Ligand binder design. Structure first.
Ligand SMILES: NC(=O)c1ccc[n+]([C@@H]2O[C@H](COP(=O)([O-])OP(=O)(O)OC[C@H]3O[C@@H](n4cnc5c(N)ncnc54)[C@H](OP(=O)(O)O)[C@@H]3O)[C@@H](O)[C@H]2O)c1
Ligand SMILES: NC(=O)c1ccc[n+]([C@@H]2O[C@H](COP(=O)([O-])OP(=O)(O)OC[C@H]3O[C@@H](n4cnc5c(N)ncnc54)[C@H](OP(=O)(O)O)[C@@H]3O)[C@@H](O)[C@H]2O)c1
Ligand SMILES: [Zn+2]
Ligand SMILES: [Zn+2]
Ligand SMILES: [Zn+2]
Ligand SMILES: [Zn+2]
Lengths: 360, 360
């Protein structure tokens, strides 16, 4: 029906026909004192959307609206709400939609690693409602995770940062990525493109690292102080031996990723940090011997504290990420859900045209 | 014959009868301007001695004197020598006997990770001589790796530190192990006992972590602020969830070591650092998923810069490690080479009685 009660968006009808989302109307999550209702106007098509919609992450309950790089307008604060959010204000939610905010971790800015963590979609809340939102009219989120968007940042250009940008940002800041450091980005995909700008933005000699040579022109436009083509090396770890401090692996999969060479190109004390979560069958397989004064580990999202620093950073030195917009609705989604599985994107797909698409 | 030319020690005759070393006389490494000749008087029986003597590390060339926790008297500096070493002075060599000292790594205190690295024994130098020393009268080492021993530190009690102590020390200091930190030591063996004292010594709430409950009394004498028995837990990672910053795995093998539970007991940003090098068949096998904001990596020896800080530290707050001396010579070695493979040691075996054993 209408906003008060029923919500509407483009939802996956089943993993089988996942490439065919349909306009749907569903029941919103029950409202709570800190919750907030945001009318969406721009969501970013993230690689994670594709995996879930497909089913690489187990069978998800359908219907199921996807999308978690949300940017919209505030349209209803909650009783005990409070944080500075004016109604009708421009905000944005990312991949985390809940946390308990009391454990040492939450209180210490590590909400992604909280025991009570709940992602923006396909996960039921402690009350049983399976999160939704993203490719729909509005989203209902707990005010702690809804952030403010600087004005000098376009909506279609901000959304991608709520997840993809934050995800690369977090391990970069946390691992000392600034003047003097040699940072390598592995996989110039969506998050890979942002990781290179953000890396440069923080003033760190950035090295983009892909397989083919196809993306050399782009990676070079982005600011990459050097590029590397895996296929044209036979063993790059030996050539770039002892060079990097940090390396962030941003790859949809982890098969065409050799983890027994990489360690060589690391400084003693270097750090290989992966961001991926592939088909629930894969594994990070690498010979143990090679982690000689070189560590490996995985990282999830980032703290809403950081999601801000990022936005602040982009806003300041004006970071122009690479986004190609689409018409929200059964069509635009399909295309995105098509071209993403073809790597056929100028890195980030940002659905827009939310307005002339749903109507009350 | 005599010191000038021929050297003498107890050498493995073959991997087969490795439990039966024999008194032997062998050709020393050619002398060089920075080299030094040290008359040994106390070597520490390290777990690595056993693996090599046995053959877990491929077939080594025999004869082969083993032992690399050496403490002795200076008996002949080299032409271009220089560093402050007085002849007849008390010094000690560890596991590294060579490095190129010019690369960024050497110049930056990471000699263990140097490309030209050479260990104290079983490795030929760039000139072809296969390092020896340890369970013998004297050892010929490049002055950069021969360190000074504080007087208030007994010889039989210092030797163990040259390798075992340094090996635990390095990752502790490098990873911030001091006031406020929760450090866990996994495997109260030789290096495990030292890791607990050194850990406490640096004022860090130390947690010894073994399988059985056998070593609770000792680990508790050492100062361990808490002990944990793997076998009496079923899943300790869940009980000690989110507790440690650092964990140093000091285990001869890596089989009875489950690496899919550990990560749970780590703080976000914690670090699991292994020190082991088992049979050349084993591997560090652990589910990839669990390294969520938790890294794993391996570490080798330590920089001679640190091998000093350690000695300084022990000397200062007087660190009494657990050593049980033995009579150098075909016998004492045998015993050590026996009890070590039975974990039948009060942690460290230090051969002594070098004097009334070889003679000129
Ligand atoms: N931990 C977190 O918080 C978090 C948050 C969001 C997403 N993720 C994960 O991030 C990934 C999606 O990132 P994205 O949206 O930026 O990616 P994407 O745009 O979907 O592109 C994937 C990129 O990874 C590389 N790639 C694809 N197939 C590969 C294969 N078989 N082997 C090696 N590399 C391959 C490609 O790089 P080149 O061809 O240039 O080498 C490609 O550009 C997913 O795995 C998702 O689950 C994690
Ligand atoms: N990287 C380096 O620089 C370096 C230098 C020297 C030595 N090392 C390595 O350090 C080890 C020797 O250390 P060490 O001399 O102190 O040891 P050790 O005295 O020989 O005792 C080994 C200890 O490890 C644990 N252990 C034995 N078998 C095990 C198994 N199957 N599974 C799990 N844990 C097991 C035991 O602890 P609990 O029974 O109490 O649990 C035991 O006390 C070797 O692996 C050697 O190659 C590395
Ligand atoms: Zn995402
Ligand atoms: Zn929490
Ligand atoms: Zn050793
Ligand atoms: Zn060097």
């Amino acid at each position: 029906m209408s906003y008060p009660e029923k919500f509407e968006g483009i939802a996956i009808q089943s993993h089988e026909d996942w490439k065919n989302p349909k306009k749907t109307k569903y029941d919103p999550k029950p409202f709570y004192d800190h919750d907030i209702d945001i009318k969406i106007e721009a969501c970013g098509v993230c690689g994670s959307d594709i995996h879930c919609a497909a089913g690489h992450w187990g069978n998800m309950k359908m219907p199921l609206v996807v999308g978690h790089e949300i940017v919209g307008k505030v349209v209803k604060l909650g009783p005990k709400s409070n944080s500075g959010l004016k109604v009708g204000q421009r905000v944005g939610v990312g991949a985390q939609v809940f946390s308990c905010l009391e454990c040492d971790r939450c209180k210490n800015d590590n909400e992604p690693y909280c025991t009570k963590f709940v992602t923006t979609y396909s996960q039921p809340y402690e009350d049983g409602y399976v999160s939704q939102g993203g490719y729909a009219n509005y989203v209902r989120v707990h005010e702690h995770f809804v952030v403010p968007i600087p004005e000098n940042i376009p909506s279609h250009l901000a959304a991608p940062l709520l997840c993809g940008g934050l995800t690369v940002y977090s391990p970069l800041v946390r691992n000392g990525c600034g003047p003097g450091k040699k940072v390598g980005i592995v996989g110039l995909g969506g998050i890979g493109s942002m990781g290179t700008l953000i890396s440069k933005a923080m003033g760190a000699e950035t090295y983009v690292i892909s397989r083919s040579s196809r993306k050399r022109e782009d990676a070079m436009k982005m600011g990459a102080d050097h590029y590397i083509a895996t296929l044209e090396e036979g063993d790059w770890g030996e050539k770039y031996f002892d060079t990097f401090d940090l390396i962030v692996v941003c790859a949809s999969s982890l098969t065409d990723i050799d983890f027994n060479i990489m360690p060589k190109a690391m400084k003693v004390g270097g750090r290989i940090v992966s961001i991926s979560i592939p088909e629930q069958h894969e594994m990070l397989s690498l010979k143990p011997y090679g982690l000689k004064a070189v560590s490996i580990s995985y990282s999830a999202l980032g703290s809403i504290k950081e999601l801000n620093q990022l936005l602040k950073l982009v806003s300041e030195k004006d970071i122009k990420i690479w986004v190609e917009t689409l018409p929200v609705g059964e069509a635009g989604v399909h295309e995105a859900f098509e071209r993403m599985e073809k790597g056929d994107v100028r890195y980030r797909f940002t659905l827009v045209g939310y307005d002339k698409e749903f109507s009350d």
